Amino acid sequence: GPPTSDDIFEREYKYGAHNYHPLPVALERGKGIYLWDVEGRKYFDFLSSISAVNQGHCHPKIVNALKSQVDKLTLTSRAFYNNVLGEYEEYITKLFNYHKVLPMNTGVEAGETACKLARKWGYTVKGIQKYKAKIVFAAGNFWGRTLSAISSSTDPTSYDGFGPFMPGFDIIPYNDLPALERALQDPNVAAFMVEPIQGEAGVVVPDPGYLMGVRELCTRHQVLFIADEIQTGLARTGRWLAVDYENVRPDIVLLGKALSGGLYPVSAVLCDDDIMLTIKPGEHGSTYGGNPLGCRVAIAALEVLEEENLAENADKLGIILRNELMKLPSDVVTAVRGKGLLNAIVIKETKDWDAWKVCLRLRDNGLLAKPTHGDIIRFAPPLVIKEDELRESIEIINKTILSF
Amino acid sequence: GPPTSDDIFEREYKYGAHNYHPLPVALERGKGIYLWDVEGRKYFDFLSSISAVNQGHCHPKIVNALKSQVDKLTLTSRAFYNNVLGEYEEYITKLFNYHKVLPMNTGVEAGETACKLARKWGYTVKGIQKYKAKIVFAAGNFWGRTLSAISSSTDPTSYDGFGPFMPGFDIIPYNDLPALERALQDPNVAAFMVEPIQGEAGVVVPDPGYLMGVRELCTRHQVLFIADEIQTGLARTGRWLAVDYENVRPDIVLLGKALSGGLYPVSAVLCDDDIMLTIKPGEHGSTYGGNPLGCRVAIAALEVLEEENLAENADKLGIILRNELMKLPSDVVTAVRGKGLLNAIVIKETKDWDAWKVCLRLRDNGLLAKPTHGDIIRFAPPLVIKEDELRESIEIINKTILSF
Numbered sequence: 001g002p003p004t005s006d007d008i009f010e011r012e013y014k015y016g017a018h019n020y021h022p023l024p025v026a027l028e029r030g031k032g033i034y035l036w037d038v039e040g041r042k043y044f045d046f047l048s049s050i051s052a053v054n055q056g057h058c059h060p061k062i063v064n065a066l067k068s069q070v071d072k073l074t075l076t077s078r079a080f081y082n083n084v085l086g087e088y089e090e091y092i093t094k095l096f097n098y099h100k101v102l103p104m105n106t107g108v109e110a111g112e113t114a115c116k117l118a119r120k121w122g123y124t125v126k127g128i129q130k131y132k133a134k135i136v137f138a139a140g141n142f143w144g145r146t147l148s149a150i151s152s153s154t155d156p157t158s159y160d161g162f163g164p165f166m167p168g169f170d171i172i173p174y175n176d177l178p179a180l181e182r183a184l185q186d187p188n189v190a191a192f193m194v195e196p197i198q199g200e201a202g203v204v205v206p207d208p209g210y211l212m213g214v215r216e217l218c219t220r221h222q223v224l225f226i227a228d229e230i231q232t233g234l235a236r237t238g239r240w241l242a243v244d245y246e247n248v249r250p251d252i253v254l255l256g257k258a259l260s261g262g263l264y265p266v267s268a269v270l271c272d273d274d275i276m277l278t279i280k281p282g283e284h285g286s287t288y289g290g291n292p293l294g295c296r297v298a299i300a301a302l303e304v305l306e307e308e309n310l311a312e313n314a315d316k317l318g319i320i321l322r323n324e325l326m327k328l329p330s331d332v333v334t335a336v337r338g339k340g341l342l343n344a345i346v347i348k349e350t351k352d353w354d355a356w357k358v359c360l361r362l363r364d365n366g367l368l369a370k371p372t373h374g375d376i377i378r379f380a381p382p383l384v385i386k387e388d389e390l391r392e393s394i395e396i397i398n399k400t401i402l403s404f
Numbered sequence: 405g406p407p408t409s410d411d412i413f414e415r416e417y418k419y420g421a422h423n424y425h426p427l428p429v430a431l432e433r434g435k436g437i438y439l440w441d442v443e444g445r446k447y448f449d450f451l452s453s454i455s456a457v458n459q460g461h462c463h464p465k466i467v468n469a470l471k472s473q474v475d476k477l478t479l480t481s482r483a484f485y486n487n488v489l490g491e492y493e494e495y496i497t498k499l500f501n502y503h504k505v506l507p508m509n510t511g512v513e514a515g516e517t518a519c520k521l522a523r524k525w526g527y528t529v530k531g532i533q534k535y536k537a538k539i540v541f542a543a544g545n546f547w548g549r550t551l552s553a554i555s556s557s558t559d560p561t562s563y564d565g566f567g568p569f570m571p572g573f574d575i576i577p578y579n580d581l582p583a584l585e586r587a588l589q590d591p592n593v594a595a596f597m598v599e600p601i602q603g604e605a606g607v608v609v610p611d612p613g614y615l616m617g618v619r620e621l622c623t624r625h626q627v628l629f630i631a632d633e634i635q636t637g638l639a640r641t642g643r644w645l646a647v648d649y650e651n652v653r654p655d656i657v658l659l660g661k662a663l664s665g666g667l668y669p670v671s672a673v674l675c676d677d678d679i680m681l682t683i684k685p686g687e688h689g690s691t692y693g694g695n696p697l698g699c700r701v702a703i704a705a706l707e708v709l710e711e712e713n714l715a716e717n718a719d720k721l722g723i724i725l726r727n728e729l730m731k732l733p734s735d736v737v738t739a740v741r742g743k744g745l746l747n748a749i750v751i752k753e754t755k756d757w758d759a760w761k762v763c764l765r766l767r768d769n770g771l772l773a774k775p776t777h778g779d780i781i782r783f784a785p786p787l788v789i790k791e792d793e794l795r796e797s798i799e800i801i802n803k804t805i806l807s808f
């Protein structure tokens with residue numbers, strides 16, 4: 001017969017690497033805001049695959065774009081041109097108002113590309129001596145799992161046992177304008193990379209005026225402002241980009257995850273000519289980067305966000321989510337925070353009561369969430385969710401939290 | 405109306421990064437060994453997207469596996485389980501006879517993972533002091549475009565202007581057993597990563613007995629043998645793995661590209677428990693890594709290679725390709741080399757006659773190939789090609805080469 005949920009866990013334990021400890025649930029089907037496990041049980045998805053399925057699971061428009069293009073052409077590599085890439089590039093650049101886009105597949109690849117961009121620009125344009133270029137990062141950052149990505153992490157889980165590490169990466173505190181200003185005194189600094197809201201750090205929202213201060217400081221000291229919007233971008237926080245909230249324009253913008261609706265690994269690096277064209281032909285690429293199949297689903301994934309006004313929906317419904325969560329007792333829930341539908345709660349963890357245990361009972365009551373820490377639960381459902389669906393989910397959260 | 409080929413070039417020039425200089429051809433459709441441009445012209449594909457489409461463009465079995473799964477579930481992330489991953493993991497591990505597999509998306513990600521694996525094992529098992537671990541690479545290597553990947557490159561195009569670089573990466577000559585044996589005297593060396601045939605270096609085939617000498621040297625000095633079979637793997641060279649030719653078993657095997665049939669970015673890192681389980685939960689991952697959609701197409705892509713005996717076909721037909729190419733005049737074609745259907749010719753380049761010009765006239769006569777250097781043309785068509793189709797393609801090569 002068909003495998004049970006425990007059979008699925010057992011099999012992955014035996015034949016799969018041990019690099020995750022997931023919440024025990026075995027999903028076989030997903031549609032919109034809902035997921036179904038192998039036993040048939042229905043759940044509210046309050047993770048959205050880390051904001052990869054902002055448009056909901058298997059959004060018909062994006063599915064059709066995939067199914068259409070697979071019968072035509074899926075991969076020529078970039079050694080030749082394909083008919084689709086140029087259409088996507090024009091679309092996404094005019095959408096976010098940058099000269100050009102460099103297509104990659106995963107989020108970390110977009111970040112790796114941004115580092116190479118910043119460095120190359122730093123040497124060939126800013127005039128930094130080779131190879132003295134620095135890139136500043138904020139403590140609590142997360143932009144992937146490559147050797148370079150974990151070299152700028154302050155999380156021991158990411159970097160411990162994986163050294164030696166990438167030089168030229170400096171770390172300052174997040175949400176700290178004086179600390180940035182101090183760091184940018186060094187003229188060898190080529191760029192500052194930062195998340196408008198830190199996701200994995202636990203939905204850490206910086207004070208109002210931070211993003212504007214960052215922009216101001218960067219421009220002043222001729223330093224590139226890299227905005228990592230792989231998680232916070234694409235309507236998740238209530239706007240096209242989280243930096244739109246302070247009308248800020250970064251030099252480089254990184255997109256990923258929701259850029260495909262969870263149907264294909266597609267990421268993007270947006271910036272203007274004087275930055276982008278520092279990389280000459282043959283000096284960068286990726287086999288699957290810019291393939292026609294990924295492009296069709298990306299166009300469709302972006303069209304869904306615009307057509308269905310999901311940025312507006314995320315903003316209105318987020319307010320309701322946060323206002324209802326703040327009604328929970330202070331001695332149980334310490335804090336509520338976020339923008340739009342990227343939210344998180346902090347719980348008063350004890351030795352015998354933690355975020356994992358809360359998420360297990362959440363699962364039991366029909367809602368899937370992941371703890372990002374022993375005392376932090378993140379709540380981020382797809383942006384297609386309706387208000388009645390949200391309030392039902394809120395009642396499941398209230399029931400579960402108070403049941404302890 | 406629909407864009408012309410020149411329109412497609414123009415558009416990408418304006419709105420796309422300048423990180424490639426492709427052969428001027430605008431493909432909109434592909435099926436098996438053939439590609440069609442926007443003007444309707446038919447071409448023999450003698451690149452196979454860098455061996456990503458070993459099974460031919462849009463192979464119906466793989467297309468069906470994709471179309472089927474997209475209606476079900478495409479991405480939960482690894483925060484939860486999905487029903488498909490465990491099935492794929494069991495399949496691929498039993499196929500290549502390793503305990504476990506760690507799933508990633510792109511080829512460079514598989515390599516990045518192998519470095520982290522080798523380092524972690526080196527510290528936690530071998531006993532190397534943190535962080536003194538080294539990884540040896542062969543000159544002329546290519547395993548992607550991350551900061552770490554270009555740090556071990558000997559190609560100035562890859563690394564120039566992108567420093568400072570990753571420490572703990574040492575470089576020795578390819579196809580050099582004494583040079584390896586010298587390098588492994590240092591007990592801080594955790595691993596040696598190498599391609600059984602160097603692809604991007606120009607299909608550089610090492611002398612017989614090299615892979616066996618590498619295995620012997622590694623075992624002796626307690627060093628991990630990493631085999632990068634992202635390009636040479638999966639029937640391309642005539643066997644499941646290029647190392648099968650010398651009955652060698654690496655400690656870590658890297659797969660990619662053809663693992664999906666060009667329908668999805670899927671890569672793999674195969675190794676046993678004592679290496680794999682050095683990475684504990686939460687110490688590594690990727691958002692899209694191991695997603696159910698990529699898994700279904702990967703299973704189907706592997707089933708095609710086996711069912712249609714494409715390794716056998718690549719071996720027989722490759723011989724014919726090389727034997728026919730060697731008939732070309734010595735003063736025009738310097739050398740012919742390769743294994744199976746991964747082949748390349750070296751031409752007697754002059755100032756006014758080069759590999760690019762040869763490929764342009766190739767394109768004109770209905771065959772698509774890319775030069776890997778001013779004097780090297782690579783010939784690698786999909787493994788589904790038939791003998792009559794091959795010989796037709798050979799006549800186009802003879803016609804073009806001799807026409808100068």
Ligand SMILES: *Cc1c(COP(=O)(O)O)cnc(C)c1O
Nearest residue numbers: 106107108143144230231690691
């Ligand atoms: C998830 C994430 C990434 C990395 O995405 P991957 O596809 O897993 O490599 C990078 N930056 C941010 C802000 C992210 O949330």
Ligand SMILES: *Cc1c(COP(=O)(O)O)cnc(C)c1O
Nearest residue numbers: 286287510511512547548634635
């Ligand atoms: C092409 C290639 C890679 C890179 O794969 P990507 O998916 O483009 O990152 C790595 N190793 C070898 C041997 C390759 O041929």
